From Swiss-Prot, chain A:
PANTHER family: NADP-DEPENDENT ALKENAL DOUBLE BOND REDUCTASE P2-RELATED, PROSTAGLANDIN REDUCTASE. InterPro entries: ADH-like_C, ADH_N_2, GroES-like_sf, MDR_fam, NAD(P)-bd_dom_sf, PKS_ER. It comes from Arabidopsis thaliana. Keywords: Cytoplasm, NADP, Nucleus, Oxidoreductase. Homodimer. Belongs to the NADP-dependent oxidoreductase L4BD family. This is NADPH-dependent oxidoreductase 2-alkenal reductase. It is found in: Cytoplasm; Nucleus, Nucleoplasm. It catalyses: an n-alkanal + NAD(+) = an alk-2-enal + NADH + H(+); an n-alkanal + NADP(+) = an alk-2-enal + NADPH + H(+). Optimum pH is 8.0 for 9,10-phenanthrenequinone-reduction. Optimum pH is 6.5-7.0 for azodicarboxylic acid bis[dimethylamide]-reduction. Optimum pH is 6.0 with (2E)-hexenal or 4-hydroxy-(2E)-nonenal as substrate. Its EC number is 1.3.1.-, 1.3.1.74. Induction: Up-regulated upon treatment with paraquat, t-butylhydroperoxide, diamide, and menadione. It is an enzyme of class 1 (oxidoreductase).
Length: 345, 336
């Protein structure tokens, strides 16, 4: 049997921002039986993610960026994290009808090899299959091992979270409230800042966009200053944190989404302050910690199921809407994690 | 005895680079008495240190202008009221920039010299507060393994020169930069750094590091900032540490420059950890007992530039920010 397999292709390399135009559409004919090779499986991608790593995987091969996760080949389908179901297998741990999450291409049917810190088993289908592109996935694992491991948190301390009503950020601020920390958020709209103050249980929050003096916002919110900072923004925002940070204060550099879309990268001036304040700027990728994903799930699935972690998503229908759904993420049109549903169950 | 005390004042605060004309000489008369009050000693300042933190203290910590400049130095006790010191033994710590001073010892500001079988100007530098920076910042905050590669900026001087000696003792590959070909030559001649360049001869600073490191940079010891950190962040390796000691590029400025390449920290999984030496003084008696076997042996060396008297001590602190100092800028106030 042959399958009518629609795909989303990248045209060529990005300079600046993404547009629906830097992407294109094709169809192929992938047959519904076995792959022979290494330890190969043909899946059917049901859900897919729009994660921001994808910008500096959409750009021209720089040695800096190409030491994270490589570069997209022009005119071949966009790789990304997303939930998938086995049609036919050539692996032992995966049998016909099993589910996985991992790095699949933006196509309806993918021909992947499973390796251990890339593709992961779904043993738990007691809770949304969509969430393995988020909370029970890689955005949620960033937030576990990132906040607990490199922010090195200790109770009562004051946390700042930027890009806080979105997948990694909304989880950090919850995992922080669960230590009885003072968490303040920052997000782009009022819709976004209201969820921070209600649903996600942060103590205060602002809209950075509607804030003139970058620094003065963080001075009002934190009278006593900041101890932890979960960095999802950069530039203008890190300069604001370094005059507002307390002594032996830590910074976890998760991302820097303001920069990704720039060719001419913004200046961070106030780095002088980390001698004066004995501060720790620490960067990480999730991939280094995917060995403790067994140890993540054992914690989070007790806590979601009991009403201690909350999570919103931004679901769009089909591959057709997946250009649209990766573009306005860089402009912030997503309210929480941007999922794009290729097929449901 | 009732001798005169020549002193170096600060007139008014500094806004840019320090000129010799923001400092002037005045004189008091000190009675070489069993002294003032609280847990006091009267001291004679033998040697003084021209340290680059002093520009931040010339800002609006902070110095009180019309009074002396405070800094580190080696001094002999003249008369005591502290239970530890007696007449004729040796202290290092925060003295004032005069001939004779009345400081009260606080244990981790001021420290007693026992080993006098070493050049004593070395206790302003190698065995002082630049030396404890180079032990603490390299062994703890740079977190080193063997074979791993170190870049040291302002390698010439004080901190930077013991860092690169302690790395090719661990078994690392060490590179350093300096601003003249006298200071670059010193790195291969005296201290035996694997490679070295002149950063002033590089228009091409990101390429300069690509050249010196085929392997990449695992460890940086940051003494400088700005453009040099922007260049080292391109050049880093995976799970690469940067130990932020100083920023002499920035101290000097009423501008204070921007570092554009901090996105590299997610990708190359970097630790930029800033420290203060004062926090590590509990580990001074462990440092002192490690390095003095090796200094005595001739294995750890040091280059100093010495200025003679309080006269040529503005000329010495001004000149530090340009880099007229070939190594550590010490001032001798008194000969033995
Ligand atoms: N370290 C890792 O390995 C790893 C893993 C996953 C994610 N990340 C990183 O962390 C960040 C995002 O978290 P996420 O994946 O959960 O996505 P997300 O937070 O769901 O969505 C991205 C957010 O981007 C914000 N934004 C867009 N342009 C902005 C700008 N110019 N300035 C400030 N904010 C802007 C938007 O907020 P607003 O609407 O609030 O402006 C939007 O909600 C990214 O930088 C990403 O690369 C890193
Ligand atoms: N606990 C701490 O964190 C702590 C403690 C002690 C010292 N420190 C810091 O570390 C530094 C002091 O010792 P050191 O090893 O640097 O040697 P130094 O000999 O005391 O300092 C002078 C050197 O500064 C360099 N320099 C001056 N202006 C510069 C500029 N415009 N751009 C780039 N480089 C410039 C020059 O070298 P070149 O021209 O040869 O490069 C010069 O030889 C200071 O930044 C100081 O504040 C920090
Ligand atoms: O920037 C950002 C990168 C995020 C990222 C997340 C998971 C990976 O496997 C690689 C990069
Ligand atoms: O910048 C830097 C300053 C470092 C510093 C170290 C020890 C002191 O006593 C004062 C400043």
């Amino acid at each position: 049997m042959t399958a009518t397999n629609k795909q989303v292709i990248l045209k060529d390399y990005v300079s600046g921002f993404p547009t629906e135009s830097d992407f294109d559409f094709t169809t192929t004919t992938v047959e519904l039986r076995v792959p022979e090779g290494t330890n190969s499986v043909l899946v059917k991608n049901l859900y897919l993610s729009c994660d921001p790593y994808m910008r500096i995987r959409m750009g021209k091969p720089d040695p800096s960026t190409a030491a994270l996760a490589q570069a997209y080949t022009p005119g071949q389908p966009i790789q990304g994290y997303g939930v998938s179901r086995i049609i036919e297998s050539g692996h032992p741990d995966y049998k016909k009808g099993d589910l996985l999450w991992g790095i699949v291409a933006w196509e309806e049917y993918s021909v992947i090899t499973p390796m251990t810190h890339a593709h992961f088993k779904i043993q738990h289908t007691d809770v949304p299959l969509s969430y393995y592109t988020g909370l029970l996935g890689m955005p949620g694992m960033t937030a576990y091992a990132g906040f607990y491991e490199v922010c090195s948190p200790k109770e009562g301390e004051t946390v700042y979270v930027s890009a806080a009503s979105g997948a990694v950020g909304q989880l950090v601020g919850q995992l922080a409230k669960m230590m009885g920390c003072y968490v303040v958020g920052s997000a782009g709209s009022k819709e976004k800042v209201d969820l921070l103050k209600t649903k996600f249980g942060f103590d205060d929050a602002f809209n950075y966009k509607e804030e003139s003096d970058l620094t003065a916002a963080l001075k009002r919110c934190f009278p006593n200053g900041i101890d932890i900072y979960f960095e999802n923004v950069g530039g203008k925002m890190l300069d604001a944190v370094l005059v507002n940070m307390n002594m032996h204060g830590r910074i976890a550099v998760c991302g820097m989404i303001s920069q990704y879309n720039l060719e001419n990268q913004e200046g961070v001036h106030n780095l002088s302050n980390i001698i004066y304040k004995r501060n720790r700027i620490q960067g990480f990728v999730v991939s280094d910690f995917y060995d403790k994903y067994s140890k993540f799930l054992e914690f989070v699935l007790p806590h979601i199921r009991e009403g201690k972690i909350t999570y919103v998503e931004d679901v769009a229908d089909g591959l057709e809407k997946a250009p649209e759904a990766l573009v306005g993420l860089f402009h912030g049109k997503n309210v929480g994690k941007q999922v794009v549903v290729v097929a449901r169950e």
